[model samples]
Target chain A: GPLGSDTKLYCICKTPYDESKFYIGCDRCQNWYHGRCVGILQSEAELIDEYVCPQCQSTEDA
Target chain B: ARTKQTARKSTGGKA
Candidate 1:
């Protein structure tokens, strides 16, 4: 439960979110995920209308 | 190549 000191956090990597890297924030949870860790390109990320991380998506689906 | 685009610039266009 102890995440890094960084203000932004990514659930996929379990590491501090880096603004220099490409990241997307989930609409439901507000958690950010790095593009590299989530297998999304900057181009594709731009096209996303609203992104929901797997954790949030699963909960919503359930 | 893409460059960093500024959404908002500080005073005098820095940061």
Candidate 2:
């Protein structure tokens, strides 16, 4: 179905995890596998200050 | 032959 509606999967961060476990760079946030020992998809705003895990819907409630 | 290279550039977009 090459029509329209580009599948944009944005992660939803609802909980907060060890930042070190999920080593996501500043420029990139979609991918957290390479950095972390376990490749897990996180839901976070890559282009925003409040980055959250879109997949689990978690974030460090500061 | 199609070969894949382990280039760090594949670390995502915004190259």
Candidate 3:
């Protein structure tokens, strides 16, 4: 069983979604991520085509 | 009653 079963907790850091913060969703996994968590600015994130998150990226590498 | 308030920080780590 998992603890965070709702949208309250998210991102790689696994923290609650602060409305004051900006976030984006991974098209592949559909998991919401914070801008800082992805190590990129909001503008840069927009241009990231096929931006597979580290979670998905690691899986494909193996 | 349980706490309904959500106050915390953000981070960048593994998924």
How do the residues A9-58 of candidate 3 rate in per-residue lDDT, one tens digit apiece?
55687776677655566555556566677775665445555555556556
Q: What is the TM-score of chain A in candidate 2?
A: 0.18
lDDT of 2 at A30: 39
Regions of candidate 1 where Cα sits further than 4 Å from its true position: A1-8, B1-15
- Candidate 3 docks with a DockQ of 0.03
Best candidate (score: DockQ): 1
What would you estimate as the lDDT of candidate 2? 0.31
Interface RMSD of each: 8.1, 13.7, 13.1
State the weakest 10-residue window (summed lDDT) of model 2 chain A. A26-35
Ranking by DockQ: 1, 3, 2
Which prediction has the highest TM-score against the true structure? 1
DockQ of predictions, in order shown: 0.08, 0.02, 0.03
lDDT of each: 0.57, 0.31, 0.56
Give per-residue CA lDDT, model 1, range A1-62, as digits (tens).
Answer: 98877654564777674455555666666666765556666754556656666655677884
Clashes of each: 0, 21, 0
Can you list the residue pairs that collide in candidate 1?
A: none
DockQ of 2: 0.02
* Candidate 3 stretches greater than 4 Å from native: A1-8, A45-50, A60-62, B1-15
Residue-level lDDT of model 1, residues B1-15, one tens digit each, is: 112112233457565
Chain A TM-score from candidate 1 = 0.61
